[PDB]
Tab-separated table of all heavy atoms in Angstrom:
chain	number	residue	atom	x	y	z
K	23	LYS	N	22.979	17.396	20.390
K	23	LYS	CA	21.909	16.857	21.211
K	23	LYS	C	21.036	15.957	20.351
K	23	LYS	O	21.524	14.955	19.813
K	23	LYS	CB	21.091	17.991	21.835
K	23	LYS	CG	20.423	17.640	23.158
K	23	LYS	CD	19.615	18.826	23.661
K	23	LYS	CE	19.372	18.754	25.154
K	23	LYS	NZ	20.662	18.812	25.895
K	24	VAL	N	19.758	16.306	20.207
K	24	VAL	CA	18.853	15.478	19.404
K	24	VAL	C	18.421	16.078	18.059
K	24	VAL	O	17.383	15.707	17.513
K	24	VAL	CB	17.609	15.020	20.219
K	24	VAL	CG1	18.055	14.260	21.469
K	24	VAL	CG2	16.731	16.201	20.595
K	26	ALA	N	17.126	18.857	17.068
K	26	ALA	CA	15.805	19.452	17.052
K	26	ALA	C	15.684	20.371	15.835
K	26	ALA	O	16.603	21.134	15.525
K	26	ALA	CB	15.545	20.223	18.358
K	57	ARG	N	23.572	9.879	17.938
K	57	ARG	CA	22.499	9.636	18.894
K	57	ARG	C	21.133	9.505	18.208
K	57	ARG	O	20.341	8.626	18.546
K	57	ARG	CB	22.464	10.775	19.918
K	57	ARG	CG	21.435	10.602	20.994
K	57	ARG	CD	21.460	11.772	21.946
K	57	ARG	NE	20.586	11.517	23.083
K	57	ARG	CZ	20.454	12.331	24.121
K	57	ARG	NH1	21.147	13.465	24.173
K	57	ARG	NH2	19.632	12.008	25.107
K	58	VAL	N	20.852	10.382	17.247
K	58	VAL	CA	19.556	10.367	16.559
K	58	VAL	C	19.689	10.746	15.091
K	58	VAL	O	20.707	11.294	14.672
K	58	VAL	CB	18.572	11.391	17.172
K	58	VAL	CG1	18.305	11.101	18.654
K	58	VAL	CG2	19.101	12.813	16.973
K	60	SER	N	16.781	12.591	14.125
K	60	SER	CA	16.239	13.837	14.677
K	60	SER	C	15.068	13.565	15.604
K	60	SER	O	14.199	12.741	15.299
K	60	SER	CB	15.780	14.782	13.568
K	60	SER	OG	15.113	15.918	14.110
K	61	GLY	N	15.046	14.274	16.725
K	61	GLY	CA	13.926	14.222	17.652
K	61	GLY	C	12.769	15.132	17.261
K	61	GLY	O	11.818	15.296	18.028
K	62	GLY	N	12.841	15.727	16.070
K	62	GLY	CA	11.722	16.490	15.534
K	62	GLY	C	11.763	17.975	15.873
K	62	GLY	O	12.823	18.513	16.184
K	63	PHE	N	10.615	18.647	15.793
K	63	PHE	CA	10.553	20.071	16.122
K	63	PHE	C	11.056	20.366	17.539
K	63	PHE	O	10.936	19.530	18.432
K	63	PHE	CB	9.120	20.609	15.964
K	63	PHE	CG	8.656	20.696	14.533
K	63	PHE	CD1	7.564	19.961	14.091
K	63	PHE	CD2	9.322	21.508	13.628
K	63	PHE	CE1	7.134	20.049	12.776
K	63	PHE	CE2	8.904	21.603	12.318
K	63	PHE	CZ	7.807	20.868	11.882
K	64	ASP	N	11.598	21.575	17.722
K	64	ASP	CA	12.156	22.022	18.998
K	64	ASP	C	11.050	22.171	20.025
K	64	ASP	O	10.195	23.053	19.910
K	64	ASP	CB	12.852	23.369	18.810
K	64	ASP	CG	13.610	23.813	20.042
K	64	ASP	OD1	13.476	23.166	21.100
K	64	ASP	OD2	14.341	24.817	19.951
K	65	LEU	N	11.064	21.304	21.029
K	65	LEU	CA	10.015	21.283	22.053
K	65	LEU	C	9.905	22.603	22.806
K	65	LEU	O	8.810	23.008	23.196
K	65	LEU	CB	10.278	20.143	23.039
K	65	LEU	CG	9.119	19.257	23.498
K	65	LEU	CD1	8.143	18.952	22.363
K	65	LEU	CD2	9.681	17.973	24.098
K	66	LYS	N	11.041	23.265	23.017
K	66	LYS	CA	11.072	24.530	23.756
K	66	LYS	C	10.211	25.584	23.073
K	66	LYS	O	9.419	26.268	23.712
K	66	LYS	CB	12.505	25.047	23.898
K	66	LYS	CG	13.328	24.370	24.993
K	66	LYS	CD	14.809	24.314	24.610
K	66	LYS	CE	15.046	23.244	23.539
K	66	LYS	NZ	16.136	23.587	22.581
K	68	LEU	N	7.827	24.991	20.937
K	68	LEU	CA	6.447	24.513	20.913
K	68	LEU	C	5.698	24.769	22.216
K	68	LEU	O	4.503	25.058	22.201
K	68	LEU	CB	6.399	23.019	20.588
K	68	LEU	CG	6.573	22.640	19.122
K	68	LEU	CD1	6.756	21.142	18.987
K	68	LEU	CD2	5.375	23.117	18.303
K	80	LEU	N	6.744	25.240	12.522
K	80	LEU	CA	6.038	24.142	11.854
K	80	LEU	C	6.009	24.336	10.341
K	80	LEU	O	6.356	23.434	9.582
K	80	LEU	CB	4.617	23.983	12.400
K	80	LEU	CG	4.402	22.848	13.413
K	80	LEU	CD1	5.416	22.892	14.538
K	80	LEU	CD2	2.986	22.890	13.962
K	84	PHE	N	7.743	21.880	7.440
K	84	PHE	CA	7.028	21.202	6.369
K	84	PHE	C	7.432	21.748	4.997
K	84	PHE	O	7.411	21.017	4.013
K	84	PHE	CB	5.511	21.234	6.595
K	84	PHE	CG	5.070	20.403	7.771
K	84	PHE	CD1	4.373	20.972	8.825
K	84	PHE	CD2	5.384	19.053	7.832
K	84	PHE	CE1	3.976	20.205	9.912
K	84	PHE	CE2	4.989	18.275	8.920
K	84	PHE	CZ	4.289	18.855	9.964
K	104	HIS	N	17.378	7.315	16.194
K	104	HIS	CA	15.916	7.436	16.201
K	104	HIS	C	15.413	8.633	15.394
K	104	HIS	O	16.092	9.651	15.266
K	104	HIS	CB	15.379	7.509	17.639
K	104	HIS	CG	15.984	6.486	18.551
K	104	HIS	ND1	15.868	5.131	18.328
K	104	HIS	CD2	16.722	6.622	19.677
K	104	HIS	CE1	16.509	4.475	19.279
K	104	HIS	NE2	17.037	5.355	20.110
K	106	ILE	N	11.870	10.774	15.320
K	106	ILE	CA	10.595	10.898	16.029
K	106	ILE	C	9.830	12.138	15.555
K	106	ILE	O	10.404	13.221	15.445
K	106	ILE	CB	10.811	11.004	17.570
K	106	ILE	CG1	11.713	9.869	18.098
K	106	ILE	CG2	9.448	11.038	18.305
K	106	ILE	CD1	11.136	8.456	17.907
K	107	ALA	N	8.533	11.976	15.294
K	107	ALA	CA	7.691	13.097	14.913
K	107	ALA	C	8.244	13.786	13.661
K	107	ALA	O	8.409	13.134	12.642
K	107	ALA	CB	7.535	14.075	16.084
K	108	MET	N	8.542	15.084	13.704
K	108	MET	CA	9.035	15.730	12.476
K	108	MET	C	10.333	15.079	11.986
K	108	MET	O	10.666	15.146	10.808
K	108	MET	CB	9.214	17.243	12.640
K	108	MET	CG	9.572	17.955	11.343
K	108	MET	SD	8.264	17.956	10.089
K	108	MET	CE	9.246	17.944	8.576
K	111	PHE	N	9.003	12.533	9.855
K	111	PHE	CA	8.406	13.129	8.658
K	111	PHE	C	9.515	13.540	7.695
K	111	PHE	O	9.423	13.319	6.488
K	111	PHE	CB	7.497	14.309	9.016
K	111	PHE	CG	6.491	13.975	10.082
K	111	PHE	CD1	6.086	14.926	11.000
K	111	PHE	CD2	5.988	12.690	10.186
K	111	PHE	CE1	5.178	14.606	12.007
K	111	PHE	CE2	5.083	12.360	11.192
K	111	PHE	CZ	4.670	13.330	12.097
K	130	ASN	N	4.906	10.167	17.326
K	130	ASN	CA	4.411	10.000	18.693
K	130	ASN	C	3.359	11.046	19.072
K	130	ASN	O	2.929	11.129	20.231
K	130	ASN	CB	5.573	10.046	19.690
K	130	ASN	CG	6.158	11.444	19.827
K	130	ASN	OD1	6.069	12.255	18.906
K	130	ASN	ND2	6.731	11.737	20.987
K	131	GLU	N	2.941	11.836	18.087
K	131	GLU	CA	2.036	12.958	18.338
K	131	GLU	C	0.801	12.554	19.143
K	131	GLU	O	0.465	13.193	20.150
K	131	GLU	CB	1.592	13.616	17.021
K	131	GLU	CG	2.564	14.638	16.434
K	131	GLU	CD	3.746	14.013	15.710
K	131	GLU	OE1	3.882	12.767	15.702
K	131	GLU	OE2	4.555	14.782	15.151
K	134	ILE	N	1.387	11.867	22.839
K	134	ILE	CA	1.701	12.980	23.730
K	134	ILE	C	0.650	14.104	23.720
K	134	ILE	O	0.820	15.131	24.382
K	134	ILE	CB	3.130	13.515	23.476
K	134	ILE	CG1	3.288	14.014	22.036
K	134	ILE	CG2	4.152	12.408	23.737
K	134	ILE	CD1	2.960	15.475	21.839
K	136	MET	N	-1.050	15.503	20.690
K	136	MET	CA	-1.170	16.362	19.526
K	136	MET	C	-1.848	15.621	18.380
K	136	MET	O	-1.521	14.467	18.100
K	136	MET	CB	0.197	16.855	19.078
K	136	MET	CG	0.111	17.677	17.817
K	136	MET	SD	0.894	19.269	18.028
K	136	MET	CE	0.319	20.125	16.553
K	139	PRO	N	-0.733	17.069	12.106
K	139	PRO	CA	-1.061	18.032	11.049
K	139	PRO	C	-1.265	17.336	9.697
K	139	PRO	O	-0.642	16.303	9.411
K	139	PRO	CB	0.179	18.936	10.997
K	139	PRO	CG	0.820	18.793	12.364
K	139	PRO	CD	0.575	17.345	12.730
Y	1	3HC	C1	3.453	18.100	14.474
Y	1	3HC	C2	4.735	18.261	15.283
Y	1	3HC	O1	5.538	17.110	15.177
Y	1	3HC	C3	4.452	18.701	16.732
Y	1	3HC	C4	5.318	18.178	17.881
Y	1	3HC	O2	6.445	18.505	18.012
Y	1	3HC	S1	4.717	17.162	19.007
Y	1	3HC	C5	6.128	16.740	19.980
Y	1	3HC	C6	6.941	15.613	19.422
Y	1	3HC	N1	8.214	15.584	20.064
Y	1	3HC	C7	8.491	14.893	21.147
Y	1	3HC	O3	7.699	14.412	21.885
Y	1	3HC	C8	9.939	14.798	21.443
Y	1	3HC	C9	10.602	13.516	21.018
Y	1	3HC	N2	11.741	13.202	21.824
Y	1	3HC	C10	12.073	11.960	22.039
Y	1	3HC	O4	11.402	11.099	21.624
Y	1	3HC	C11	13.318	11.590	22.815
Y	1	3HC	O5	13.765	12.675	23.564
Y	1	3HC	C12	14.457	11.089	21.934
Y	1	3HC	C13	14.203	9.721	21.356
Y	1	3HC	C14	14.631	11.989	20.712
Y	1	3HC	C15	15.709	11.095	22.785
Y	1	3HC	O6	15.537	10.182	23.825
Y	1	3HC	P1	16.496	10.066	25.102
Y	1	3HC	O7	17.829	9.810	24.515
Y	1	3HC	O8	15.756	9.266	26.094
Y	1	3HC	O9	16.618	11.556	25.614
Y	1	3HC	P2	15.599	12.338	26.518
Y	1	3HC	O10	15.993	12.150	27.925
Y	1	3HC	O11	14.217	12.021	26.106
Y	1	3HC	O12	15.930	13.835	26.176
Y	1	3HC	C16	17.219	14.201	25.747
Y	1	3HC	C17	17.416	15.661	26.026
Y	1	3HC	O13	16.967	16.306	24.865
Y	1	3HC	C18	15.777	17.024	25.102
Y	1	3HC	N3	14.871	16.877	23.935
Y	1	3HC	C19	14.428	15.712	23.459
Y	1	3HC	N4	13.677	15.889	22.355
Y	1	3HC	C20	13.609	17.206	22.137
Y	1	3HC	C21	12.979	18.101	21.152
Y	1	3HC	N5	12.204	17.652	20.152
Y	1	3HC	N6	13.224	19.416	21.291
Y	1	3HC	C22	13.967	19.902	22.255
Y	1	3HC	N7	14.550	19.161	23.159
Y	1	3HC	C23	14.416	17.839	23.180
Y	1	3HC	C24	15.272	16.485	26.429
Y	1	3HC	O14	14.397	17.399	26.986
Y	1	3HC	C25	16.582	16.229	27.152
Y	1	3HC	O15	17.220	17.445	27.313
Y	1	3HC	P3	18.330	17.621	28.425
Y	1	3HC	O16	19.420	16.607	28.208
Y	1	3HC	O17	18.904	18.981	28.168
Y	1	3HC	O18	17.399	17.438	29.626
Side-chain angles (χ1 to χ4, degrees):
Chain K
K23 208 181 202 63
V24 303
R57 183 181 188 176
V58 300
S60 173
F63 290 118
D64 187 352
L65 223 39
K66 281 148 285 147
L68 282 170
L80 259 51
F84 292 122
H104 314 300
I106 309 297
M108 186 67 211
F111 309 146
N130 71 334
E131 277 78 356
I134 60 90
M136 176 126 192

